[PDB]
């Protein structure tokens, strides 16, 4: 209860609802010397770890030649906004098999 009370105010309630296998765009702050820039990352969510303040999700992006995986901390200040583009119709909690999708229309 001490831990929970400490993290409730640190957590943010503006977290959008997304599911594994969804196409997600996430904006992340970037520091270059003395300037703050907003970087846009496009990818598909392949894993979500729910632990409250420590909740995180993995996004895989197919870059020019090879894929890139990126683990974001949902409640970190670095991430500003998260938007969902497609509602992937998968039936697995962790989509690790994409290393080596339908659309839900709901």
């Amino acid at each position: 209860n001490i831990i929970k009370q400490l993290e409730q105010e640190q957590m943010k309630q503006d977290v959008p609802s997304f599911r594994p296998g969804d196409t997600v765009e996430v904006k992340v702050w970037v520091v270059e010397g003395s300037k703050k820039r907003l970087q846009a990352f496009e990818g598909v969510v392949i894993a979500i770890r729910n632990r409250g303040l420590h909740s995180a999700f993995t996004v895989r992006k197919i870059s020019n030649g090879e894929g890139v995986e990126r683990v974001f901390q949902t409640h970190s200040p670095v991430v500003d906004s998260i938007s969902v583009k497609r509602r992937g119709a998968v039936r697995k909690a962790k989509l690790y098999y994409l290393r080596e999708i339908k659309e839900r229309l709901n």
Binding site: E7, Q10, H75, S76, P77, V78
Partner: protein, 144 residues
């Protein structure tokens, strides 16, 4: 104090600091040692509470002598000839506000992140020995 789990805090700039969160009730003095009797300067302090039926009266009489309520365990720290304390005095966590490095028992030179008195809570950057619910002793860093 008592160790109560572990968590992390996110700063405005973005970096996240893993913090050990220690709950520290008001520490109330029970005995004061001096050169005349004990040959050294130290204060004996207690914390927490103990069941009346379980606390043996040899300690209860010792606690009652100082007007102190029976706590769990006893610890004492040596003085630096620059401070004075009186029997029965209550010590809270605000004393750590002015110090940035603390020693947790020993893991030494740990940054202090936040201190508050309304909730009797102290925060330390890093990990400290022992599992949750264990007893810890926090003192200012000696290696200045």
């Amino acid at each position: 104090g008592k160790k109560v789990g572990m968590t992390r805090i996110f700063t405005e700039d973005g970096v996240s600091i893993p913090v050990t969160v220690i709950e520290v009730e008001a520490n109330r003095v029970t005995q004061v040692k001096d050169l005349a009797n004990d040959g050294y300067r130290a204060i004996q302090v207690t914390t927490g509470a103990k069941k009346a039926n379980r606390v043996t009266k040899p300690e209860a009489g010792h606690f009652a002598k100082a007007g102190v309520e029976a706590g769990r365990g006893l610890w004492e720290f040596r003085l630096a000839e620059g401070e004075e304390f009186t029997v029965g005095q209550s010590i809270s966590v605000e004393l750590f506000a002015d110090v940035k490095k603390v020693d947790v028992t020993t893991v030494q030179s740990l940054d202090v992140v936040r201190v508050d008195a309304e909730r009797n809570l102290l925060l330390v950057k890093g990990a400290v020995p022992g599992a949750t619910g264990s007893d810890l002793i926090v003192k200012p860093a000696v290696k200045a």
